[PDB]
Amino acid sequence: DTKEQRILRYVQQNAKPGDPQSVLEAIDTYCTQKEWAMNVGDAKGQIMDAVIREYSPSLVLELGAYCGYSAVRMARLLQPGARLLTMEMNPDYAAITQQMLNFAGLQDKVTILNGASQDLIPQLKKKYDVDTLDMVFLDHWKDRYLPDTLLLEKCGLLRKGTVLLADNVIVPGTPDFLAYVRGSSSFECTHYSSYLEYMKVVDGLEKAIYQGP
Ligand SMILES: CNc1ncnc2c1ncn2[C@@H]1O[C@H](/C=C/CNC(=O)c2cc(-c3ccc(F)cc3)cc(O)c2O)[C@H](F)[C@H]1O
Ligand SMILES: [Cl-]
Ligand SMILES: [Cl-]
Ligand SMILES: [Cl-]
Ligand SMILES: [Mg+2]
Fold first, then answer.
1. Cys-Cys crosslink for 104: which of 8, 20, 75, 170, Cβ 3.0 to 4.6 Å?
2. Which CATH number goes with the domain that contains 75?
3. Hey, which bits of the chain come out as E strands?
């Protein structure tokens, strides 16, 4: 099987069904003791948690679910009624993510969309009845952070105060995105230095708050 399949099994057998914390802990243990994987991890995850709690978003979009670790992290902190949409183009990973969220008991708060962001973003308003997003978590292919930020704006999905939170702005890095938001009067940016998941390597999150056109 695959590393991602190996990870979901561990959670099912080492976490409490319906207990998101036990799920996060099982994934962190597996990835530290057995096989590394590109989950956001606990170090950056704690920063994400602090951001989510601060802004209290009603509707969050995640680009790139992978195995559902960040989706579990965020969804567990959403207020009743608030929702997460997560886009994952790899059908195998989308299915792992859905099962991870089911196991955690978070399925009513999350919609996992199996498709590519560039195809799904233009459908959010008409098909998924979205007005604007309160927060966007970017964690998909690094060269797509900037194209998708520009597409979100084109599609009218950002409002004054929409929070963009971007993983991996140091490693692997997203140089065009980072230069763009830091240079744009339409974003107010903050850098949160941290560490690459499961590694003693510096990484960071960038928060970029949209200011309008
Ligand atoms: C392009 N549109 C997409 N739409 C929907 N789902 C997508 C889309 N594009 C990808 N996906 C989906 O988003 C995910 C991909 C995430 C990519 N992430 C990384 O590469 C990444 C890499 C490292 C890393 C660091 C050090 C090192 F030595 C090796 C690797 C660390 C990280 O935290 C990462 O996030 C998923 F796999 C893919 O199907
Ligand atoms: Cl993740
Ligand atoms: Cl609810
Ligand atoms: Cl970590
Ligand atoms: Mg990442």
1. 20
2. 3.40.50.150
3. 59-63, 83-87, 110-113, 133-138, 158-166, 187-195, 202-210
Using DSSP, state whether 188 is helix, strand or coil.
strand
Integer Cα distance of 183 and 15 in angstroms: 44
89 has binding-site annotation: yes
Which residues approach ligand 1 with their CB closer than 6 A? Answer: 38, 63-64, 66, 87-90, 93, 116-118, 139-141, 144, 167-168, 171-172, 196-197
Residue 118 annotated in ligand binding: yes
179: domain range?
1-213
Measured in Å, residue 80 CA sits from the centre of ligand 3 at 4
- Angle among Cα 113, 15, 59 to the nearest 5 degrees reads 35
Residue nearest ligand 1's atom 29 by CA: 172
Closest CA to 194 of 176, 164, 169: 169
| Method used to determine the 3D structure | X-ray
CA of 56 relative to ligand 3 center, distance in Å: 15
∠ at Cα 31 (29, 33), nearest 5°?
65
